[PDB]
Design a protein around this ligand. Structure first.
Ligand SMILES: Oc1ccc2c(Cc3ccc(OCCN4CCCC4)cc3)c(-c3ccc(OCCN4CCCC4)nc3)sc2c1
Ligand SMILES: *[C@@H]1O[C@H](CO)[C@@H](O)[C@H](O)[C@H]1NC(C)=O
Ligand code: NA
Ligand code: NA
Lengths: 28, 250, 12
């Protein structure tokens, strides 16, 4: 899908969820 | 989910609930990958050892939910299945190798703030993100402990574990079509999937394009959140060819 | 607990 993986209430509004930072910080 | 927390509204819009018609009950998790296709684990539909063998007419798919038991009026969408496709080489007799299945909805579902598909990985995304130590996220309405149920969708983030460690933690022969995840006994953090969560998605957020990718499918484990044991997941990219095959042909 | 009643349209 063209806009797969982009959440209406988060990525599309440029808002982060409570714990996504944990994932990103693990990606060295 | 064991040792997780309540999900935020709209946090996993691709999360799907596999629901039994009669008796009405939660069977497994699943994921929306397009307006008409749902991805899940084959053992959710077929597993002879436990006398499990469901057909299209046996169940329903519920999309956009948050609460486990309430019929979320004007928010959730309930769909009927048109056809189920189980991988031809699903090995249910020995190790659940190729534990994967596709389900075609009778009619497409419309997207909303609460319903949106997740992406399937490409070789580069998989090569780049499927590394030991990198964390993924698991979601589900399953049991809160091995041996009760949550009120709303639960979520937990877990690190991918080195292949040797996965191998040395079980007697089962593990294949290239699976990977294991979870914290080690000395990491001082717990968390796992549990009964009712299988078939659900293991996702990762690409730091290159900011999209969420489903890297795995909750497949099997021995108990839930036991020290020194790990949850095993179906390797979605290793099986992408079959997925495209079914979708393109059917 | 047990689940709530879902519309009949989805059970036929
Ligand atoms: O991290 C994970 C990942 C997946 C799972 C699963 C799925 C799962 C686990 C094991 C399995 O089968 C046996 C394992 N072998 C198969 C191949 C390799 C090992 C298949 C799927 C759990 C689960 C689900 C149902 C069940 O109820 C049994 C009770 N049932 C009797 C009838 C219905 C309820 N007990 C545990 S716990 C768990 C933790
Ligand atoms: C499962 O159900 C299908 C369809 O009703 C049937 O053809 C098959 O023989 C059953 N058993 C197995 C193990 O597939
Ligand atoms: Na072993
Ligand atoms: Na564990």
């Amino acid at each position: 899908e063209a806009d797969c993986g982009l959440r209406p209430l988060f990525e599309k509004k440029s808002l982060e969820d409570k714990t996504e930072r944990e994932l990103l910080e693990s990606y060295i | 989910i064991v040792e997780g927390s309540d999900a935020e509204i709209g946090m996993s819009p691709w999360q799907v609930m596999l629901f039994r018609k009669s008796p009405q009950e939660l069977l497994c998790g699943a994921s929306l990958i397009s307006d008409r296709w749902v991805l899940t684990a084959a053992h959710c539909l077929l597993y002879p050892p436990w006398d499990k063998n469901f057909t299209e007419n046996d169940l329903l798919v519920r999309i956009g939910k948050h609460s486990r038991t309430r019929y979320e009026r004007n928010i959730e969408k309930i769909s009927m299945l048109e056809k189920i496709y189980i991988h031809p080489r699903y090995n249910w007799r020995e190790n659940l190798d190729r534990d994967i299945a596709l389900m075609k909805l009778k009619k497409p579902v419309a997207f909303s703030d609460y319903i949106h598909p997740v992406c399937l990985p490409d070789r580069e995304t998989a090569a780049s993100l499927l590394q030991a130590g990198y964390k993924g996220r698991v979601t589900g309405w399953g049991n809160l402990k091995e041996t009760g149920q949550p009120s709303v969708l639960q979520v937990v983030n877990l690190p991918i574990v080195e292949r040797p460690v996965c191998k040395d933690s079980t007697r089962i022969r593990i294949t290239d079509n699976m990977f294991c995840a979870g914290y080690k006994p000395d990491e001082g953090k717990r968390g796992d999937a549990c009964e009712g969560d299988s078939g659900g998605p293991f996702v990762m957020k690409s730091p290159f394009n900011n999209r969420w990718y489903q890297m795995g499918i909750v497949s099997w484990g021995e108990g839930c959140d036991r020290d020194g044991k790990y949850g095993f997941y179906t390797h979605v990219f290793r099986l992408k060819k079959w997925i495209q095959k079914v979708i393109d042909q059917f | 607990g047990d689940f709530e009643e879902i519309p009949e349209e989805y059970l036929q």
